[PDB]
């Protein structure tokens, strides 16, 4: 499948990221079984990426673009939008569906 976006808390409902803007997010990344493999919250530093530059997985590029500033959402991402058949050795297994808890803090 693609990316599914399920709201956890609403944002402003008006400000959506455009290509080339820097998204500032806090995120927690989990496997489908619930195992956490990455989290900006445990590092206490938000993660920044520029939308449209393929600095993140495809599911993030398409999922975060559907979020408004201040929204917290659950993104469910199929492997084709993720680390695919290869996965990531020792971190993400092959053909893994990933779940991300993502809060869009601001755009730069």
How is the chain split into domains, by residue range? 2-108
Task: Give me the sign of the Cα torsion angle 67, 107, 25, 83.
Answer: positive
46 — phi, psi (to 5°)?
A: -60, 150
Give the span between the Cα atoms of 11 and 22, in whole angstroms.
17
Name the helix (H) or strand (E) containing 95. Answer: none
* Catalytic center residues: 27, 37-38, 57, 83, 100
Radius of gyration of the chain (CA): 13
Token pair for residue 89? 């050795």
SS3 track for 51-85: CCCCCCCHHHHHHHCCCCCCCEEEEEECHHHCCCC
Count other Cβ atoms within 10 Å, centred on residue 9.
9
Give the span between the Cα atoms of 73 and 23, in whole angstroms.
14
Task: Give me the sign of the Cα torsion angle 88, 89, 91, 96.
Answer: positive
Name the helix (H) or strand (E) containing 23. Answer: strand 22-31
Structure-solving method = X-ray
CATH of 2-108, one of 3.30.2270.10, 3.10.50.40, 3.30.1600.10, 3.40.190.10: 3.10.50.40
Give the span between the Cα atoms of 108 and 100, in whole angstroms.
22
Resolution (A): 2.0
Place of tokens 């997985």: 57
């Amino acid at each position: 499948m693609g990316v599914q976006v399920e709201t956890i808390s609403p944002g402003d409902g008006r400000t959506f990221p455009k290509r080339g803007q820097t998204c500032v997010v806090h995120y927690t990344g989990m496997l489908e079984d619930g195992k956490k493999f990455d989290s900006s919250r445990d590092r206490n530093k938000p993660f920044k990426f520029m939308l449209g530059k393929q600095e993140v997985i495809r599911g993030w590029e398409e999922g975060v673009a559907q979020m408004s500033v201040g929204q917290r959402a659950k993104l469910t991402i199929s492997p084709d939008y993720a680390y695919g058949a290869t996965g990531h050795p020792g971190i993400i297994p092959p053909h893994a569906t990933l779940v991300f808890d993502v809060e869009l803090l601001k755009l730069e």
